[PDB]
Ligand binder design. Structure first.
Ligand SMILES: NC(=O)c1ccc[n+]([C@@H]2O[C@H](COP(=O)([O-])OP(=O)(O)OC[C@H]3O[C@@H](n4cnc5c(N)ncnc54)[C@H](OP(=O)(O)O)[C@@H]3O)[C@@H](O)[C@H]2O)c1
Length: 315
């Protein structure tokens, strides 16, 4: 109930703790507090640059006997400047080393377009144009598959992929490890009906991020739709004696979609996991689903004209 079983028949907890934009130090405390509140799924990434702080938190809770490594699901992601196999292996060893773990439960392609290798996460030319690499997500996957055969990663997945891109991966000549999740932005204004149906029927679980609409996001504008403030959510929240955020998170759990709300605030961290004590009615689920406007806050929009750009397609 609190988990979705992957194609491997590993259990992925339905609620996890997101880590993007959590500052260093705040993150170590946030992860400690989350473990204490019963979180077992953690989502971290090389490009966040806070993995070391996550790793400290986990090591300390394991040392203290609060949790066993086998009951944690720890996810990280390969950034798009490291698609080329040797660079992939270096990036990965740094992620695993920062996290202080012997293996990851899940390793994701972060973004389907490859970017030029170098020190910058977002390489630009003198003009300020983003530079792409020659390596594709299929090249990166061949590299990642070796991690699985090695026991360093239990399963591979993708993030921000459309269904044609997943098909291409599923139809890759010589594919060894099928992807087990697709981690995409998901909330009442971007429900992802078709993408979720596609994933579940292809052996692929879905992890929702930005379930709260990613308010901390740096480029938020007054004109943007406001996920927290959806009027129907307030109504449903009052009815169930839960918070608006709790309803936004349950909306994902109740569809058997994992969610990774981000928080470094203790009250919010404890509250976000209190979503296994109520059920949304069929009318409430239909009312939430009525809200999609296919609106996205998250992605690399500057590269929309470059070959691998996922958000052009319907799903
Ligand atoms: N491309 C990708 O694959 C990708 C992209 C973006 C994110 N992600 C992952 O998904 C996670 C979630 O995305 P997100 O971080 O963009 O946004 P989000 O989880 O929707 O929203 C986070 C924001 O909401 C606040 N918040 C959390 N709980 C709350 C509550 N109960 N009530 C009110 N406010 C609350 C947080 O502040 P406090 O911290 O103070 O609580 C933070 O400002 C990321 O951290 C990361 O792990 C993946």
């Amino acid at each position: 109930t609190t988990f979705v079983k992957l194609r491997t028949k590993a259990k992925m907890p339905l609620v996890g703790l997101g880590t993007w934009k959590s500052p260093p130090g705040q993150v170590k405390e946030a992860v400690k507090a989350a473990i204490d509140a019963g979180y077992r799924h953690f989502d971290c990434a090389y490009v966040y640059q806070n993995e070391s702080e996550v790793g400290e938190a986990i090591q300390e809770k394991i040392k203290e006997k609060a949790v066993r490594r086998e009951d944690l699901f720890i996810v990280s992601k390969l950034w798009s400047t490291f698609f080329e196999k040797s660079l992939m292996k270096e990036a990965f060893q740094k992620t695993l080393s920062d996290l202080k773990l012997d293996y990851l439960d899940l390793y994701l392609i972060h973004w389907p377009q490859g970017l030029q290798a170098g020190k910058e996460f977002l390489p630009k030319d003198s003009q300020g144009k983003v530079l792409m690499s020659k390596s594709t997500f299929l090249d990166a996957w061949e590299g990642m598959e070796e991690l699985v055969d090695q026991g360093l990663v239990k399963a591979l997945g993708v993030s921000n992929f459309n269904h044609f891109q997943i098909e291409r991966l599923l139809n890759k000549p010589g594919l060894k490890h099928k992807p087990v999740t697709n981690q995409v932005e998901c909330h009442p204004y971007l429900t992802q009906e078709k993408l979720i149906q596609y994933c579940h029927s292809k052996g692929i679980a879905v992890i929702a991020y930005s379930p709260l609409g990613s308010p901390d996001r740096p480029y938020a504008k007054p004109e943007d739709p406001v996920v927290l403030e959806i009027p129907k959510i307030k109504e449903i929240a009052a009815k169930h004696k839960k918070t608006i955020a709790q309803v936004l998170i349950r909306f994902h759990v109740q569809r058997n979609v994992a969610v990774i709300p981000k928080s470094v605030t203790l009250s919010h961290i404890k509250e976000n996991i209190q979503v296994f004590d109520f059920q949304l009615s069929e009318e409430d689920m239909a009312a939430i689903l009525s809200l999609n406007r296919n609106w996205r806050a998250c992605g690399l929009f500057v590269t929309s004209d470059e070959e691998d750009f996922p958000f052009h397609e319907e799903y």
